[PDB]
């Protein structure tokens, strides 16, 4: 019944002042994109940076199994748009936040469905 | 002086035609650092400028294009060049990458190990290599043609590059190979391309554009590398990151280039003309299968 909870480990490490995972791969782009959260090509808007998805995925970067019976990664091979205000910690942002299954924006950072 | 607004500078044709002897490379801005946009890694800027230049050539871009990228890892364990290539290439393009050392990648498949362990059934439409031997820094004699991964790359090109396909293989003053230059003459066109962000380095990408599978031109590669160093030695390039700011036309155009299987007997001059113009790829269009050779040892006793 034992499994490592790496998401919690990183969340607590951050909470206690640890420096975020670095070397997330930031892309050059127009910054006139849709602003959707996770895309097949960079889609940052004026308020976002775009990153290569693998480099922003805690499981990819930590060499650990993905939380998924199939182990499928929803970031690798795509681009993640991160609010510029949070781009110091893309891995933390993707862990803590959620994508709206309807409009494809981050809940709280673009999703206007409510 | 408009060179600064380009992605970089390609070796002018008149320097290719010379017969120079090899000198030491002595760049006036050697090692100077470009000012990159905030938070952008060198390899992202470098690969962006490489792709921007490749947008000016006649690359074949088929549906289900196949691209392989050697030397794709970093000491940081991520793959910035692969991320730029996948951004540049049409969505759905099959992208495989590889490196000696472990890294995580946005590529569809990644093989870790010496490139000589990498094998594949299929032919490829574009080959990218950024491999460089750290021991090349231990310069202790005349600058001779290097082997190692360059020997693999030449064979891989001759064996596994589709006709019409293209390559970009990173070289430097001391990281180079005479047979790779010679093989540039087996393409419809070739150059040595220096990125504006790394204009202070003797790095260049040797680009073969539209592979013909036979020599169009006989190139002595010892002479051509000397020509390249001569060009670099006498043509200072000012560092520039200007082109990084305009990404509106960055994506590689999906040309839908035709793929045909054809046997070595059906390649006539009209076919060769289509290949030369970026208008045809010739290879099987089967499924893509790759593998890494694994050496087995039991170290007990
Ligand atoms: O961006 C680098 C790229 O990732 C790779 N690379 C270089 N070192 C690497 C290591 N240790 N590991 C992995 N990958 C490495 O190669 C790219 C280019 O690196 P760069 O340092 O800019 O290459 P460069 O110095 O131009 O060419 P060489 O490495 O082949 O030269 C070896 C040796 O010769 C002297 N040298 C070369 N050049 C062009 C010189 C010059 O213009 N002026 C002077 N005074 N000396 C020059 C140097 O001693 C150099 O180290
Ligand atoms: N010599 C050699 C090789 C160097 N590299 C890599 O190129 C990258 C160079 O900047 C680096 O990440 C390195 O690890 C190789 N990769 C596979 N096979 C090889 N034979 C090599
Ligand atoms: Mg440099
Ligand atoms: Zn992942
Ligand atoms: Zn929504």
Cβ A58 vs Cβ A89: under 8 Å: no
* Residue-range definition of the domain harbouring residue B126: 1-301
Resolution of the experimentally solved model in angstroms: 2.0
Is beta strand A48-52 parallel, antiparallel or unpaired with respect to A79-83?
A: antiparallel
Residue A17 CB neighbour total at 10 angstroms: 6
Q: What is the largest CA-CA distance in chain B?
A: 67
Q: Of all helices (H) and strands (E), which one includes residue B195?
A: strand B187-195
Going by C-alpha positions, the residue among B6, B3, B9, B7 that lies closest to residue B202 is: B9
> What whole-number distance in Å separates Cα of residue B268 and Cα of residue B132?
38
Going by C-alpha positions, the residue among B197, B193, B199, B237 that lies closest to residue B34 is: B197
Q: From chain A, pick out residues whose CB is under 8 angstroms from the CB of B196.
A: none
Residue window 3-62, chain A: list those with CB within 8 Å of chain B.
22-30, 40-42, 49, 52-55, 57, 60-61
> What whole-number distance in Å separates Cα of residue B249 and Cα of residue B71?
27
Residue A97 CB neighbour total at 10 angstroms: 15
> What whole-number distance in Å separates Cα of residue B30 and Cα of residue B139?
17
Q: CB of B133 closer than 6 A to ligand 2?
A: yes
Beta bridge partners of B267: none
Instruction: Decide: helix, strand or coil at residue B54.
Output: helix
The number of distinct structural domains making up chain B is: 1
CB contact under 8 A, B83 and A27: yes
**In this structure, what token pair is assigned to residue B108?**
């569809």
CA-to-CA dists, residue A41 to A77, A89, B91, B285, angstroms: 9, 20, 8, 25
Residue B170 CB neighbour total at 10 angstroms: 20
**In this structure, what token pair is assigned to residue A61?**
């970067």
Residues 6+ positions from B105 with CB-CB distance below 8 Å: A54, A76, B72, B73, B78, B79, B82, B97
Residue B225 CB neighbour total at 10 angstroms: 23
**In this structure, what token pair is assigned to residue B212?**
């013909």
Give the method of determination: X-ray
Q: CB of B99 closer than 6 A to ligand 2?
A: yes
Residues 6+ positions from B235 with CB-CB distance below 8 Å: B9
Going by C-alpha positions, the residue among B42, B67, B27, B47 that lies closest to residue B172 is: B27
Cβ B44 vs Cβ B225: under 8 Å: no
């Amino acid at each position: 019944a034992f499994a490592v909870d790496a998401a919690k480990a990183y969340k607590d490490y951050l909470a206690s002042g640890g420096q975020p995972i670095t070397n997330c791969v930031k892309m050059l782009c127009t910054h006139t994109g849709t602003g959707q959260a996770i895309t097949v090509t960079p889609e940052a808007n004026m308020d976002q940076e775009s990153f290569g998805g693998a480099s922003c995925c805690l499981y990819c970067r930590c060499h650990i199994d993905h939380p998924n019976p199939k182990g499928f990664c929803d970031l690798k091979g795509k681009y993640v748009q991160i609010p510029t205000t949070c781009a110091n910690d893309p891995v933390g942002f993707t862990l803590k936040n959620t994508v709206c299954t309807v409009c494809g924006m981050w809940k709280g950072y673009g999703c206007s469905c409510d | 002086s408009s060179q600064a607004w380009q992605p970089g500078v390609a070796m002018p044709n008149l320097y290719k035609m010379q017969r120079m002897l090899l000198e030491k490379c002595d760049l006036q801005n050697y090692g100077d650092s470009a000012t990159l946009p905030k938070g952008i890694m060198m390899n992202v800027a470098k690969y962006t400028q490489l792709c921007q230049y490749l947008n000016t050539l006649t690359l074949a871009v088929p549906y289900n294009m196949r691209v392989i990228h050697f030397g794709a890892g970093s000491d940081k364990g991520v793959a910035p060049g692969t991320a730029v290539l996948r951004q540049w290439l049409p969505t759905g393009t099959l992208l495989v990458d590889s490196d000696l050392n472990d890294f995580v990648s946005d590529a569809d498949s990644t093989l870790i190990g010496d490139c000589a362990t990498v094998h594949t059934a299929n032919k490829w439409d574009l080959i990218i290599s950024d491999m460089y031997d750290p021991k090349t820094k231990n310069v202790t004699k005349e600058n001779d043609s290097k082997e190692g991964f360059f020997t693999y790359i030449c064979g891989f090109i001759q064996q596994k590059l589709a006709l019409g396909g293209s390559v970009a293989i990173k070289i430097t003053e001391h990281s180079w190979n005479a047979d790779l230059y010679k093989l540039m003459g087996h393409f419809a066109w070739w150059t040595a391309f220096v990125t504006n962000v790394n204009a202070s380095s003797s790095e260049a990408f040797l680009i073969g554009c539209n592979y013909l599978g036979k020599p169009r031109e006989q190139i002595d590669g010892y002479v051509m590398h000397a020509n390249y160093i001569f060009w670099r030695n006498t043509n200072p390039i000012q560092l520039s990151s200007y082109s990084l700011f305009d990404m509106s036309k960055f994506p590689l155009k999906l040309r839908g280039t035709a793929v045909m299987s054809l046997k070595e007997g059906q390649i006539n001059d009209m076919i060769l003309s289509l290949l030369s113009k970026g208008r045809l790829i010739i290879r099987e269009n089967n499924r893509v299968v790759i593998s890494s050779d694994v050496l087995v040892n039991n170290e007990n006793l």
